[PDB]
Amino acid sequence: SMDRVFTTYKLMHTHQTVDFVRSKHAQFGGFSYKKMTVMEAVDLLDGLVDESDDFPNSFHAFQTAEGIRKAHPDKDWFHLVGLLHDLGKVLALFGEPQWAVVGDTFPVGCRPQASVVFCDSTFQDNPDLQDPRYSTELGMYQPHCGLDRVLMSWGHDEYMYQVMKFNKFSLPPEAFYMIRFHSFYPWHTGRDYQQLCSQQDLAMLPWVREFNKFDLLPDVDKLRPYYQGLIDKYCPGILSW
């Protein structure tokens, strides 16, 4: 598998510190990079190949949405979750390097656990891992705080979650959560990070695993009007990114 995939994660696991994530929350927390509609966001990602993997990520938006739609035909909000879920990748078009945008996510501020991809080979130069506040199992966290109180590595999950919240998308809470934690492989697949999750995360786990099935070229022009209706329904108009 790619040397580029490995290099993406090496850079990610070096530079994603507590300070770094906090800096990125400040940098993007104003939503003044762009005014654009959801469909513009989808089309912008025509010019993005995901280096943590090939085709444009935009096709993947439709593919995912259509996979969910086949399996859950009467659940329109869930089809849209498919379309929306990787649109935080617009960060890359905003000048962000891909280790700060794509890839599996992991909590910052506590020791990385075994199922964090390339855990053994990629954390050497992370400065946080010699800081006694962050080098331990729990790090800066209290036991069983819940994932919504964890500071995750920064990229397309928290970013899109924040875009949705700011713009007041009218999706159910499960839709927000799926998107926010869909890259958190160590938790939803590795079953790591049990020290941090709560009952609330246990309730959400079946939703995330169900979504992940469809995350893991279509005739996209024919699909546009349907997905436009869903956008009009759940997240209409020019949004702040």
User: Which residues of the shown chain bind ligand I1N in the complex (CB under 6 A)?
Assistant: 50, 52-53, 86, 102-104, 182-183, 185
158 is a contact residue toward Fe ion (CB under 5 A) = no
Q: How far apart are the first and last CA of the chain?
A: 33
Query: Closer CB to ligand I1N, residue 35 or residue 213?
Result: 213
Q: In the complex, what is the shortest distance from the CB of residue 69 to ligand I1N, in angstroms, rounded to a whole number?
A: 19
Binding partner of residue 66 among Fe ion, ligand I1N, none, CB cut-off 5 to 8 Å per kind: none
Give me the residue whose beta carbon is nearest to ligand I1N: 183
Distance of closest approach, residue 110 Cβ to Fe ion, in angstroms: 22
156 is annotated as contributing to ligand binding: yes
- Please count the other Cβ atoms lying within 10 Å of the Cβ belonging to residue 122: 20
For the bound state, the minimum distance from the C-beta of residue 81 to Fe ion, rounded and expressed in Å, comes to 11
Burial of 6 (C-beta count, 10 Å sphere; 0-12/13-18/19+): middle
Give the one entry of ligand I1N, Fe ion, none that residue 52 binds, where binding means its C-beta sits below a cut-off of 5 to 8 angstroms depending on kind.
ligand I1N
Q: Looking up tokens 């160590």, which residue turns up?
A: 186
Q: Is the separation of the CB atoms in 65 and 227 below 8 Å?
A: yes
Q: Are 184 and 117 in contact (CB under 8 A)?
A: no
Distance CA 239, CA 166 (A): 9
Closest CB 65 distance from Fe ion, rounded Å: 11
Considering the complex, state which of residue 83 and residue 196 has its C-beta at the smaller distance from Fe ion.
83
Residue 53 sits in the site that holds Fe ion (CB under 5 A): no
* 241 contacts 88 by C-beta, under 8 angstroms: no
Among residue numbers 76 through 95, which ones bind Fe ion (CB under 5 A)?
Answer: 86
Compare residues 66 and 86 and give the one whose CB is closer to ligand I1N: 86
Q: Does 43 bind Fe ion (CB under 5 A)?
A: no
215 annotated as belonging to a binding site for a ligand = yes
Is 1 annotated in a binding site? The answer is no
Instruction: Return the one option of ligand I1N, Fe ion, none that residue 51 interacts with (CB less than 5 to 8 A, by type).
Output: none
For residues 138 and 151, which CB has a smaller minimum distance to ligand I1N in the complex? 151
Give the nearer residue to Fe ion in terms of CB position, either 148 or 215: 215
| Residues that constitute the known binding site for substrate | 50-52, 89, 103-104, 182-183
User: Residue numbers of the site for Fe ion (CB under 5 A)?
Assistant: 86, 215
